[PDB]
Every structure is written in structure tokens, then in C-alpha cells.
């Protein structure tokens, strides 16, 4: 589990897993004048690390302005960082750049400008990224078409090293839907993840403020990437402002893996208020978090809700139905497999409502609702301040009733001898004697 915010004040997080035991960790910062980077061995570690400013803008000419979404990368045995910039005569003139450095440890070592990133047309471009697929590295990034009446749209190419592309940029999206076009029209933010043979772009969309969002394009692993046609763009966002649980405007992800590599992690900024004082650019207060990405059975990646602050949630999967888990349809708990609105699945374990070291286990797309009895079925419903309520809504937390090392098993707290289990599917508080009955009460957290 992740607690919320990784960062206060950095924004277009990118994160970096090195062979060397280290997560790296470098953002935009609000002065847009800098690149940082911070490294910890954990995930969770980084919100404590301490910055080096590894690079600063130049007092004049290129370089030397709107720095801006900065990423890391390891390629070939040397760090490379990737950012945009435009000059101190022309703030606006935003183009990519690269900085090399060969030392061991990036955040000590010496960087070398290795230049702009050449692109056939002289335009607005930024948030370059560089991933690998069928053993051919690629670059995509942002870019005004200039022949577009837009911000910027999505360009890939082939690389003949880490700061030149190689033959000619493939336009693989632009904004033209109606979430892409809130404010200004923009796709931003490529981000590349691989999963069963099939890889999905993320990219950011519209303004930046409460309605950016994220897209994605979806293409086989084996295609041509380089052709637009092998990518298929989403026609809704994939992730987006949640009201609920007062997240606004998430976007510029990327994504990195856990501490044994099995989880992908969805790495992005949002903010936790709406409404913004004035320009959006000059609005300081984006911050970076962090959630673990859930794969489909379909092998698409489930990017949920932007989930509250704090901890995490987590999901509950059966003892006897593996591959079902506790999920809230019209309110009502039930288990089931396959849940594709992912936050119906998902929930938090809190401290109780009704104390004595009590549970509640508290809704991840409906904040303030939790898992409650009443007439001794399983509802998700809304804490109304009363004492029965939290009595309905607290349980003891037991070891598994047929797992005791490794499973979980809730025990009513006003019905003791009842416990949290399913039946046909649905969930209710009844007591427990079978060997069956013993399966049904119990569950298993993150597994
Ligand atoms: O559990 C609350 C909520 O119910 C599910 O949506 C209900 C669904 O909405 C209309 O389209 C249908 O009439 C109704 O069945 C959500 O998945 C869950 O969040
Ligand atoms: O930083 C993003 C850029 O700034 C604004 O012009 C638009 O949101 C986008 O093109
Ligand atoms: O919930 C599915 C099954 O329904 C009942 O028949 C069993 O107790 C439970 O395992
Ligand atoms: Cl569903
Ligand atoms: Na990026």
C-alpha cells in the first residue's frame, strides 16, 4: 500500500527502477527553472528523500526557461534525462532536450548537454519519453502539427541513439474528442506500458486544470509501431477527475513496479480542489501519488478512480472463489470475479467506528459509505453520524477461519459468533460452524 501524496509541489512525476536497488524519482517543480531527482530503495521511501538539483536553466538563450516534465532513463550503461525548455528571448519556443551522464549514481554525477531532440518540423514540443518494444527502441512525445488547429498531438519514431531519432515521426493521435479539447486542445504526456503482449500509451489531455485527464492508445507488442493504424485510441478517458473522493485533474503519468516487480504502479500528479485562482500554469500546488494499475481478464490495464488521500485501497478476493472479490453492485456487497468497474472492488481498512480496536472497511469510489449489516445482509452505505451505524459498520478483524497465517476473517462486533461470509454469492453476517461455512468467511487482502 501507497500513502497519498508521494509529493507536495512536483508535478509530471516520473519515476525510474535501476538494477542498483534504487527507486529514481524526478518531476516538474513550480518555478519551472530546474531539474531535481531524488533516489530510496522503496516506493514509499521517496516521499522522504532528500532532492539534489542535479541541472539548472542557462541565464540565457536555449535552455533557459519552462523547464519542464523532466524524465529518467538507464540506456546502454549511461543516464539519460529527458525535458523540454524554451529560451530566455522566447519562453514560449518549448522544444526537447537531452542531458547524459555516465557516473554510477546520477544524483552526485556530472550531466553533459547532449542538445535538442531534431525533429523534421520546427515546432512546440515537449514531454519526450523512450521505451523498448520487440527489441527496437522508440521515442514518442508531444508536438504541434503545425497544419492542426490545436496545442499539440502524439508523435512516435524509431531512435539511433538516446538523443536522436531515427528516419521519420509517425502522428499517432490528436486532440479532436471532446475531454481532449476542454480549454485547449492537447495530448500530452506519452507514457508506455507492456502487459501479455499488447502495449498501451497513456496521454494526458485538455487544460491543466480539473479536466485533464488521461487517454490511451492500445496496439500489439508485434505491429508496426510506426503505423497509426496499429494503435486504437480510447474513446472515453481512462482515468479522470473524481469529485468523490476529491481528486482533480489527474494526468502526466508514468509508470514503474513494486518492490518484487509484479505490480505495475501508476505514478501521476492531480490536485485536491477544484477551482483554481487564475492561470493554471501559475497554480503551484500539483502533487504526485501513486496506485497500483489492476490487469483486466481481458488484458487491458484498469487504471479505477484517482483514490482518496491517505492509505491505499485494497481489494478482497474469496478463500473457496479465488478469483472472486467482495464488490458493491446497487449497493449491494456481494462476491464476484471480473469486476470491471474496479472501485465497486475496492476498499480501505480503518480504524473502527465503534472503537475498542475495531475495523471499518470504507468504500474507495463512495468516501464516508462502508461496508455494513443490516438484517444481517452486506450493504455499502453512508455513515449518517449515528451509533448504530457504527456498530452495523465495525468488525473484529480475525486470522482466517480456513487460512489462519495468511487469510483474513471479519467477526461482527455488536453480533459476536457472526461473521462476515458469502452465500450464493452475496454477502451477510451469519455464524460459522462447517468446514464450509469456515470458507466462506473468509478472505484474502491484495492477493
Ligand atoms: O453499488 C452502487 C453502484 O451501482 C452500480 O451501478 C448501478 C447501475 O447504474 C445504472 O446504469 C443501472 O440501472 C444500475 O444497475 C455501480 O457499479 C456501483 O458503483
Ligand atoms: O504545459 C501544457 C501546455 O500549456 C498550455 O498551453 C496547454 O495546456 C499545453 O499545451
Ligand atoms: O457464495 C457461493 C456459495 O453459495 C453457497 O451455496 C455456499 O455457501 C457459497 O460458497
Ligand atoms: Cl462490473
Ligand atoms: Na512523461
Avoid at 517543480?29 to 539534489?52: F, H, M, S
Avoid at 476542454?182 to 479536466?211: C, M, R, W
Amino acid at each position: 500500500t501507497f500513502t497519498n501524496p508521494l509529493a507536495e509541489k512536483r508535478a509530471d512525476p516520473h519515476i525510474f527502477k535501476h538494477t542498483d536497488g534504487y527507486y529514481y524519482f524526478t518531476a516538474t517543480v513550480p518555478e519551472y527553472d530546474r531539474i531535481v531527482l531524488r533516489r530510496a530503495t522503496t516506493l514509499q521511501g521517496l516521499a522522504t528523500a532528500p532532492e539534489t538539483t542535479i541541472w539548472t536553466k542557462h541565464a540565457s538563450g536555449v535552455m533557459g526557461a519552462h523547464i519542464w516534465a523532466p524524465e529518467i532513463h538507464f540506456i546502454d550503461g549511461k543516464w539519460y534525462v529527458y525535458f523540454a525548455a524554451g529560451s530566455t528571448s522566447d519562453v514560449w519556443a518549448i522544444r526537447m532536450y537531452v542531458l547524459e551522464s555516465g557516473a554510477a549514481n546520477p544524483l552526485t554525477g556530472s550531466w553533459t548537454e547532449k542538445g535538442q531532440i531534431a525533429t523534421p518540423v520546427s515546432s512546440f514540443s515537449l514531454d519526450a519519453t523512450t521505451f523498448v518494444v520487440n527489441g527496437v527502441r522508440h521515442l514518442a512525445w508531444a508536438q504541434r502539427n503545425p497544419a492542426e488547429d490545436n496545442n499539440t498531438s502524439l508523435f512516435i519514431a524509431k531512435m539511433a541513439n538516446p538523443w536522436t531519432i531515427s528516419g521519420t515521426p509517425t502522428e499517432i493521435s490528436q486532440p479532436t474528442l471532446s475531454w481532449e479539447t476542454v480549454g485547449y486542445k492537447v495530448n500530452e504526456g506519452p507514457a508506455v506500458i507492456q502487459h501479455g503482449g499488447k502495449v498501451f500509451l497513456t496521454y494526458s489531455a485538455s487544460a491543466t486544470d480539473a479536466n485533464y485527464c488521461l487517454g490511451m492508445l492500445s496496439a500489439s507488442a508485434s505491429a508496426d509501431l510506426l503505423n497509426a493504424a496499429s494503435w486504437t485510441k480510447s474513446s472515453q478517458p481512462v482515468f479522470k477527475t473524481s469529485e468523490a473522493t476529491g481528486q482533480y485533474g489527474p494526468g502526466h503519468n508514468s509508470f514503474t513496479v513494486s518492490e518484487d516487480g509484479k505490480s505495475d504502479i501508476l505514478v501521476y500528479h492531480d490536485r485536491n480542489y477544484k477551482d483554481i485562482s487564475g492561470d493554471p500554469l501559475n497554480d503551484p500546488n500539483r502533487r504526485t501519488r501513486l496506485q497500483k494499475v489492476y490487469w483486466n481478464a481481458d488484458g487491458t490495464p484498469n487504471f479505477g478512480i484517482p483514490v482518496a488521500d491517505g492509505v491505499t485501497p485494497v481489494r478482497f478476493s474469496s478463500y473457496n472463489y479465488p478469483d472472486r472479490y467482495i464488490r458493491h453492485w446497487d449497493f449491494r456487497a456481494r462476491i464476484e470475479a471480473n469486476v470491471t468497474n474496479l472501485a465497486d472492488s475496492q476498499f480501505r481498512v480503518v480504524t473502527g467506528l465503534a472503537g475498542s480496536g475495531t475495523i471499518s472497511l470504507e468504500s474507495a469510489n463512495y468516501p464516508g459509505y462502508y461496508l455494513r449489516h443490516k438484517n444481517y445482509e452486506v450493504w455499502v452505505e453512508k455513515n449518517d453520524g449515528s451509533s448504530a451505524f457504527k456498530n452495523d459498520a465495525s468488525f473484529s478483524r480475525r486470522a482466517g477461519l480456513a487460512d489462519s497465517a495468511d487469510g483474513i476473517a471479519f467477526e461482527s462486533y455488536n453480533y459476536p459468533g457472526r461473521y462476515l461470509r458469502h452465500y450464493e454469492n452475496l454477502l451477510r453476517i451469519q455464524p460459522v460452524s462447517t468446514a464450509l461455512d469456515r470458507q466462506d468467511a473468509t478472505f484474502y487482502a491484495e492477493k
